[PDB]
From a paper:
The gamma-tubulin ring complex (γ-TuRC) is the principal microtubule nucleation template in vertebrates. Microtubules are formed de novo in a process termed nucleation, which is spatially and temporally highly controlled by γ-tubulin complexes, composed of γ-tubulin1 and associated γ-tubulin-complex proteins (GCP). In most eukaryotes, microtubules are templated from a preassembled γ-tubulin ring complex (γ-TuRC) that determines the position and direction of microtubule growth. Here, we used cryo-EM to identify and characterize γ-TuRC assembly intermediates after recombinant expression of the complex, which allowed us to delineate a comprehensive stepwise assembly pathway from a stable 6-spoked core to the mature 14-spoked γ-TuRC, identifying successive stabilization and conformational locking of γ-TuSC units as central principles in the assembly process.
To confirm the correct assembly of the γ-TuRC in our recombinant expression system, we first analyzed the consensus structure of fully assembled γ-TuRC and large assembly intermediates (10–12 spokes) to increase the sample size. For this set of particles, we obtained a cryo-EM reconstruction at 7.5 Å global resolution. Structural features of the cryo-EM density indicated that all GCP variants have been incorporated into the complex in the correct order and that the lumenal bridge was formed correctly, including stable integration of actin and two copies of MZT1. Unexpectedly, we identified three previously unresolved MZT1-GCP3 modules and one MZT1-GCP5 module (see below) on the outer surface of the γ-TuRC, associated with the GRIP2 domains of GCP3 subunits (right). Having located the MZT1-GCP5 module on GCP3(8) and the MZT1-GCP6 module as part of the lumenal bridge, the four additional MZT1-containing modules resolved on GCP3(2), GCP3(4), GCP3(6), and GCP3(14) of larger assembly intermediates and the fully assembled γ-TuRC represent the remaining four MZT1-GCP3 modules. While the MZT1-GCP modules may play a role during γ-TuRC assembly by providing extended intersubunit interfaces, we could observe these modules not only in assembly intermediates but also in the fully assembled complex, indicating that their association with the outer surface of the γ-TuRC is not merely an effect of an incomplete assembly process. Instead, alternative patterns of post-translational modifications on the recombinant γ-TuRC could be an important factor in stabilizing or destabilizing the association of the MZT1-modules on the outer surface of the complex.
Numbering used by the authors:
A (entry chain P): 3 to 41, 45 to 93, 101 to 177, 180 to 279, 287 to 306, 313 to 447
B (entry chain f): 7 to 113
C (entry chain B): 485 to 504, 524 to 815, 823 to 893
Amino acid sequence: REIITLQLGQCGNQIGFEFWKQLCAEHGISPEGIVEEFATDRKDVFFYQADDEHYIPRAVLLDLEPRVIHSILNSPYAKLYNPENIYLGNNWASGFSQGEKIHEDIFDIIDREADGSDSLEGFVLCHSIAGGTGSGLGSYLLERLNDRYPKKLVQTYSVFPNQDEDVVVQPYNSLLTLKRLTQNADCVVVLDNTALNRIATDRLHIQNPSFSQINQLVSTIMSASTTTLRYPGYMNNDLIGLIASLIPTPRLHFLMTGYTPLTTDKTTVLDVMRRLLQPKNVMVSTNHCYIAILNIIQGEVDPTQVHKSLQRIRERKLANFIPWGPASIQVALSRKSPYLPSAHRVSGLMMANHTSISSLFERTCRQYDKLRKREAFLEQFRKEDMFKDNFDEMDTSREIVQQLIDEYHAATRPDYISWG
Amino acid sequence: KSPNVLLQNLCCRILGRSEADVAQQFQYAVRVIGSNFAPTVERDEFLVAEKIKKELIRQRREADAALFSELHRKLHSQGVLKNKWSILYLLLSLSEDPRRQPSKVSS
Amino acid sequence: LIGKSINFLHQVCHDQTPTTTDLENAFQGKIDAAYFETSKYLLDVLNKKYSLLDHMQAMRRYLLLGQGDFIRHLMDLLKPELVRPATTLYQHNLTGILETAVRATNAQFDSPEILRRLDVRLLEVSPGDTGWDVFSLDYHVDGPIATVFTRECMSHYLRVFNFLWRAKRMEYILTDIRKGHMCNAKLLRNMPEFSGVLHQCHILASEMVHFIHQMQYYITFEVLECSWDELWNKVQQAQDLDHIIAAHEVFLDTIISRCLLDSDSRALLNQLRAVFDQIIELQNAQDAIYRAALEELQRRLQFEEKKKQREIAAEEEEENKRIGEFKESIPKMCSQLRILTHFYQGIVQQFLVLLTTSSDESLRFLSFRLDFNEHYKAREPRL
């Protein structure tokens, strides 16, 4: 129905501003919020409807120590948005404590959009794990979110902070954030900073202005993930019906994303399907087996051959698969978006559940362990000491991620009738 | 025989009580059938068959909706019943929809 | 054939505008030229008065549910009256809902003509009828463009509508199941006694959301879109009116042949009804297990308040008995859930190998789409 997005932290506000600029480029609209005279699509998914039909984006402008927000302020896209969502440390505990003391006014802004909106479907978070500004604040707000509304949805977009390795408490901060992320979020879009770094170096010669370029990649990802909702199709025109298929159990809600374009500066489905199924076309990094795989294709394609395509990949047996109850490769087709320059129309997308991400979690689990065992990487912070005198939150997050990795490995087994 | 005793055979068939075990139920049957015994209304047998077919489409018993069409041909064909409208009106009024079950009954 | 054009043109299409062998064959020179003029004009003027093409485009989206947006909002308003009996409802109730959905969605940017023609009806009621048993929209056909919309063709489109309505409904009913499962596994997160039966109910639900969700895409790419392409190809070509209705005879026959209305495979729809009923059984069971869980939570809360009501003990002995009851109620919940699980498995096995016996290549395509893993269909135990 009506979906409100949320953005917090400087990096989260950056990717949100890039996303709304990217949809201003995508749709036939002006940077005033005014529709053009040659413009179709649905604008009730993320556009709060003003009374000039200023399609104001449903995102709440959350920050701490605003620096890039001043750059957001002086922009010709600051007249595209601003429903008055703007707001006045680099650690988890300080952001947590400062978040709890100002929680009432941000919840007032939340209630302002939410009662201001027609209906409600879900809250989609733009987040960076261990971002300093994002961490602590976002975890507290996620606790507030599900406690306030158990009838609503909460999806998160979260990056995995690994820039080839300085903040040395970043394992602990990430543990607290993913602990809240597993038990207090309904669907997780996990992004790998290293894999996107490798592709960004691959397509270009860049290593230093990396944020701007991966912002392009990720905004293509978020636009693609909601394109079937924004555009008149037939399935997954709602968030929840889109989310419900991939998740077999409410701790496995972690989403690997795939995308056939890498250097983006006739065609048919059977090519790009087997192209996409190879994991170097996947921009996220014993035996691992996919739990469920879903594909959506947008471009210049004949839809009548796709069953023969599907027939081939059934004869491929190209992914080994999970030995319990039935999953398939899950195909959808969407319209290519008008009102924008459309070169190389054909682009595919893979939303899939894979077990290999647990190994990435194990990397943080290893790192946290050695730093915890050195007695040398908390550095005696007053917020951390005053909020928690016994330091048991690390223990709670550790047993949670241990139970989760055990759930991963037991789902890998042919028996998941046993406990995880 | 006569319609008064013939209403009493009906009360012996439906009920598990006889004619002197109960005559008060038989007294309700004479309350309704009396002052309605004789035809005074328009009757057409074409429409009531066309409402059993429209009910069997809604039952998704679509093989029997076309099997009634060959059995309704036999109802006109033998023609020992004076009003062929009445018995079809009775079974149509006593209907229900125990939903979809397809599959011809082979007459 | 030309005298079936001009005479039709002058009376029912209402154009009084002008249209003007050893016998040396005078005929052939003039006849073809007259044809090349007249039939093209009969197929130009009639489209720009009451459009034949626009209303058949709207027929795919609004009646055969191709629109997506509008049907979602129309089903977010009309939900209670269809979970209710349709023996106690009538037409004007259903009509009142429609205006709100046409203003709220992007049907407000569409022309007034397609909304004016769009209306609801309720047909003759079954003596045990419910809102999901029969319901249809109408979008009535009128004018001289009902020479392409045959009376039988419209009488079959609502027969299509009911099956499509059922499947589209069950995709929101399963999603309420997933939503309740979520909502009450973030209310129950600290109790150990319910964790097993919870996880088994969720593992039971997720095979179903799957099975039905991938069946829905076969409907997208074969039953609606590939049958709309053949209509567009045979309306683009057409040189006379008789071809435009021949395409209309294909735009139904493809749909009804693949939505199980055909005679050879009615037995398959009779099995497809039971999985929807099993989804209903799953709703019952999940709401009951989370009701027992809400009752334990409220018991814990009244336990929490009795302590401060006593101190400022004598309430532990009452608590151990409630704990004992909740702990002994677990294996019966396990037994009911495992019966439902095996039941669903034993019918999915029969369904998937019945597509590899039935008539026509088309329905065999579905059996590949449902299971790529070979989880079923090769190994009948759940691998």
